Amino acid sequence: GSSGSSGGEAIAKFNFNGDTQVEMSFRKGERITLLRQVDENWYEGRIPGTSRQGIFPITYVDVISGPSSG
């Protein structure tokens, strides 16, 4: 184990089109391996197969590990 840390799982509610390397693009449905939260309205994570890394808004991705909602 190189790096040991907990995160969570999320689902891209929509498609993201990043322009800068810092930002990361994901396809609707793709699994975003949550790594860490950059800002209050920006979650960080990578994508399987593309081993990409960057930032992205919340509204875009819907995390499962959270509060209760109907």
Side-chain angles (χ1 to χ4, degrees):
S2 276
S3 295
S5 68
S6 187
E9 272 89 35
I11 302 297
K13 288 189 71 171
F14 289 107
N15 89 116
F16 188 101
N17 68 98
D19 203 81
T20 56
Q21 176 199 341
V22 178
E23 290 159 336
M24 176 273 279
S25 62
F26 44 70
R27 195 174 183 173
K28 181 190 150 82
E30 290 279 300
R31 206 163 156 162
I32 301 155
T33 311
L34 285 176
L35 304 161
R36 68 205 89 186
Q37 189 170 12
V38 177
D39 270 90
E40 200 175 26
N41 276 322
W42 293 83
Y43 275 127
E44 209 194 285
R46 68 207 171 70
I47 300 301
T50 54
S51 288
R52 280 167 160 166
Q53 194 187 17
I55 52 185
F56 47 74
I58 327 313
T59 37
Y60 270 65
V61 313
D62 204 56
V63 40
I64 302 79
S65 184
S68 190
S69 181

